[PDB]
Structure formats: C-alpha cells, structure tokens
Amino acid sequence: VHVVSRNAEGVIVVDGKAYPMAEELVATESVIQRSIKAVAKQIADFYRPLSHRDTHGGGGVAPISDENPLIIISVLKGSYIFTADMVRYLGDYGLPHVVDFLRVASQLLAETQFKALRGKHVLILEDIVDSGKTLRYILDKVQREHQPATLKVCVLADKPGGRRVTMQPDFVCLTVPNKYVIGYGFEVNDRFRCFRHIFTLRPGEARRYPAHL
C-alpha cells in the first residue's frame, strides 16, 4: 500500500516524499512492477515456443535457447531502468535472451554491437510510444541493417492520444494520460528518471532546466 496525499502547499506526497513538479500521480511502483511482470510472462509465453537461425551449431533453424537466445535491443537512454526490471522478470519466466543497446536523440548516437541478427527473433524495449515517429525510425533502421526473422516492440507506456503516425506496439505494460509523464525513466533534461512512480508534469515545467548538460 502506497500513501498518497497532498501537503499544505497542494503538492503531491507519496510515502512521505513531495513531488512539487507533478500535476497528478499516474502509477505507483507497485502497479508499474506488477504490469511489467505481467507483460514479461506474455513475452516469455510468446517466444519460448519459437525457433530461428542457429548460429551456435552451424544452421539451420533451432529453438530459442541459451545457445540461440531471443535478441533484445534496448533504446538508450530512456529505457535503461525499464529494461533492467524487465530482463529480471524474463529470467524469472525462463526466457533465454541477450540485450544490446542503441542510442537515439532528438539522430542515431550509438549503434548496436551485435552483428549476427539475420534470421533471428528481435524484440525492441522502448520507454513510450507517443507520436510513433521515434519507433518508426528505429524499426526501419533495425529491419534494414539486421534483416531479422521477426521484429516486435514492447513499450513500458502507450500514450494513444498522441499518435501522428501508425505505430501499435506488440506488448504494452501501461497506458498513460495524454500529458507529459515523468518518473520511472521519464525525464525533463535527465531529471526525474529515478522516481519509483510515474506522474504527469505541471504545465510549462518542461523548460525548468534549459542548460545543456
């Protein structure tokens, strides 16, 4: 049970901690973790029956295994906390997998280092689908460079009211309101990512830290 209240300044307090930058609470840690673990079970149940290119034993097709694991691509920097939690739940459910990272910014800043993804099942882990443009860019790049057998996306958050292009992730942990979200990886110039809960940001507060880090 989380304790959620407001102090005399009208500021949201969760478990004794004040969040003056927040407009509303979206999800507590308990709700977020339960939602991630539920999707981890969906992911493990979906992939464990599948087979793909055998690079351990010299061809042809073999079951997903520790020898030929599911390939996971995590999008830095936003998905790193979500990924750390998800992979541990995937391990709990016994899904063989390995993780590489790509970094994008608003440009590709860092490329994946994995070089044998041809004919492999590949799952992208991303923080949020809002407009859909970021994931359309990533999916196109990953498909053209790696030629995977299949390419799917799991997002922590879906903001369905923000779409500008068609983008429907295969796995969604939580739905967020049509507002700027902060906490659990979600940032304002790298601030707020360490919050264990997700909140909506007070309007105009997205310009609070103008200085480039």
Ligand X SMILES: O=c1[nH]cnc2c([C@@H]3N[C@H](COP(=O)(O)O)[C@@H](O)[C@H]3O)c[nH]c12
Does 134 participate in binding ligand X (rule CB under 6 A)?
A: yes
Does 158 participate in binding ligand X (rule CB under 6 A)?
A: no
Does 128 participate in binding ligand X (rule CB under 6 A)?
A: yes
Angle in degrees, CA 176, 181, 185, rounded to 5: 105
142: amino acid identity, one letter:
V
Burial class (CB in 10 A: 0-12, 13-18, 19+), 86: buried
List binders of ligand X among 180-209 (CB under 6 A). Answer: 180-181, 186
Looking at the Cβ atoms of 133 and 202, the one nearer to ligand X is 133
Longest dimension (CA), the chain: 67
Helices (H) and strands (E) in the chain, counts: 3, 14
Least separation in angstroms between CB 179 and a second copy: 20
Does 127 participate in binding ligand X (rule CB under 6 A)?
A: yes
Instruction: Give the tokens for residue 96.
Output: 């063989």
Which residue in 85, 127, 130, 158 is the catalytic one? 130
Looking at the Cβ atoms of 168 and 189, the one nearer to a second copy is 189
CA distances from 121 to 23, 118, 133, 175, 197 (A): 40, 9, 23, 26, 32
List binders of ligand X among 28-87 (CB under 6 A). Answer: 78
Least separation in angstroms between CB 45 and ligand X: 26
Asked if 130 is an active-site residue, the reply is yes
Least separation in angstroms between CB 153 and ligand X: 11
Among 130, 148, 174, 183, binds ligand X (CB under 6 A): 130
Least separation in angstroms between CB 165 and a second copy: 26
Looking at the Cβ atoms of 85 and 127, the one nearer to ligand X is 127
- Among all residues, which ones are annotated catalytic? 130
